[PDB]
Design an enzyme around this catalytic site. Structure first.
Site, PDB file in Angstrom:
ATOM      1  CD  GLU B  56      -3.300   0.994   1.954  1.00  0.00           C
ATOM      2  OE1 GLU B  56      -3.258   1.237   3.254  1.00  0.00           O
ATOM      3  OE2 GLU B  56      -4.281   0.480   1.389  1.00  0.00           O
ATOM      4  CE  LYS B  58      -2.922   3.959   4.988  1.00  0.00           C
ATOM      5  NZ  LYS B  58      -2.728   2.977   6.152  1.00  0.00           N
ATOM      6  CE  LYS B 118      -7.760  -0.391   1.899  1.00  0.00           C
ATOM      7  NZ  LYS B 118      -6.568   0.084   2.791  1.00  0.00           N
ATOM      8  CD  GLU B 167     -11.905  -2.157   5.058  1.00  0.00           C
ATOM      9  OE1 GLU B 167     -11.167  -1.912   4.017  1.00  0.00           O
ATOM     10  OE2 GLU B 167     -11.996  -1.357   5.981  1.00  0.00           O
ATOM     11  CG  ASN B 188      -9.440  -3.516   8.406  1.00  0.00           C
ATOM     12  OD1 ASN B 188      -8.901  -3.116   9.464  1.00  0.00           O
ATOM     13  ND2 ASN B 188      -9.284  -2.828   7.357  1.00  0.00           N
ATOM     14  CD  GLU B 218      -8.621  -5.234   4.895  1.00  0.00           C
ATOM     15  OE1 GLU B 218      -8.818  -3.828   4.775  1.00  0.00           O
ATOM     16  OE2 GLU B 218      -9.122  -5.617   3.595  1.00  0.00           O
ATOM     17  CB  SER B 219      -5.068  -3.059  10.074  1.00  0.00           C
ATOM     18  OG  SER B 219      -5.826  -2.377   9.003  1.00  0.00           O
TER      19      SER B 219
END
Lengths: 261, 260
Positions: B56, B58, B118, B167, B188, B218-219
């Protein structure tokens, strides 16, 4: 509550993105139109010649009264109005209330050599671009419907695109607001928007308040040549009339009668 | 009568603008080359017995503030490809993440990886946008959209040849996600109300996911060991940005995370 905050701005971005691409397309379309015909300038030329100046209106239906004319043919109506001496056209492009359509403006205009007004409810300068892309030579600003900032923006956009702007007023407060704008075309409308009562004395009163550099357009309750002669005594020599002419068989002859008697 | 006219007239104006805008985006989508195959690239990594990374790009986030002051999407895309990423995720939201639409297109042009838009999608118009910018996959957030809108988003993506990452943050969202067709389910770990991050969320949701879905963790994933832990719950595909973005040599950081 970060998701609700994101959604709120994201919906504004989506609206702005769509408006941007739509306006880009209309800009392209306005650059491919031929120049405006000169709506105000046509009316002033009639009045300079000592003739009544008619804005002849093509309207398919009335809210309240239904279909105006069993046979509705915008190009034929345009030709008949030109033949009878009309100086300009008004074409309703609103669909839900009047059963007009944008294409009626373009077709009517292509069928004659008169300048043509987009007759519709404008709330957004995007619609002024629309009007020009359809061939319009003039737009309508309704003082009862829009505030001072929006009226100015509508008028400025029309002028930037080479078009005139007819400013519609129904009372004294509206007239005073209209005189903050630059446009010389002021429509003095005899039909009360709260009551729907129609009385020629309204335009007579509003005309006394207007300065002599404005070109006053009488609208509603005007049926006969004698009505025109009466309003002429208050300085009103330009008129916007449609339904009453449309509901007569020979539209050209009805128009000549109204203008000349 | 005037207030009524204004109400329907404003809706006509909005619909007129939406129509011309969408016709333009449709024209743009017909001039794009075909999508690169986002899901297929992740599956090819797993087939080779490697972890599949959606890497990602970001700059910032509301939970974290500014992540990477010096920000070069094309360079970052190259570095992620060099370090073994299977696909890219590029933030295109500006106010909350300091991304931009243009970052997706530039990052994608700088490498050969498939790329996800995203962003927060509330309107199928945005799916046409994504494709027009070159996107190979879109994001659907179950916490943000109802069932009808989720299905419409996914159907639009599929008609345009793109994948959709769905998600989910909890069991209710996972169950709703199973009404959709997409095989890409993102589990997530970040609470969106509190910003607490806990890998145990994806481990718990994995116990509910049927085997035909490809789970993306995710995360909260910082290390190769984090990946090995999530692998024990059947999660071998990950979306990671912050931990990698925070490090100077992104290619080397990515190789270390993926291979140890």
């Amino acid at each position: 509550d970060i998701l609700r905050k994101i959604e709120a701005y994201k919906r504004e971005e989506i609206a702005a993105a769509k408006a941007r691409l739509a306006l880009d397309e209309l800009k392209a379309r306005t650059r491919d139109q031929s120049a405006p015909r000169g709506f105000l300038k046509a009316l002033e030329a009639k009045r300079a010649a000592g003739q009544f100046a008619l804005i002849a209106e093509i309207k398919k239906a009335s809210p309240s009264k239904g279909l105006i004319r069993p046979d509705f043919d915008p190009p034929a109506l345009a030709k008949a109005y030109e033949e009878g001496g009309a100086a300009c056209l008004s074409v309703l492009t609103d669909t839900p209330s009047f059963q007009g359509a944008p294409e009626f403006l373009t077709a009517a205009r292509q069928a004659c050599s008169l300048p043509a007004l987009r007759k519709d409810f404008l709330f957004d300068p995007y619609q002024v671009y629309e009007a020009r892309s359809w061939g319009a030579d003039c737009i309508l600003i309704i003082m009862a419907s829009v505030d001072d900032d929006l009226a100015k923006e509508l008028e400025d956009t029309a002028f930037a695109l080479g078009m005139d702007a007819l400013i519609e007023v129904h009372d004294e407060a509206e007239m005073e607001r209209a005189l903050k704008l630059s446009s010389r075309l002021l429509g003095v409308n005899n039909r009360n928007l709260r009551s729907f009562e129609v009385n020629l004395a309204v335009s007579e009163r509003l005309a006394k308040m207007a300065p002599s550099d404005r070109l006053l357009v009488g609208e509603s309750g005007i049926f006969t040549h004698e009505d025109c002669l009466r309003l002429e005594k208050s300085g009103i020599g330009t008129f916007l009339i449609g339904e009453s002419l449309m509901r007569q068989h020979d539209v050209a002859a009805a128009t000549r009668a109204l203008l000349t008697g």
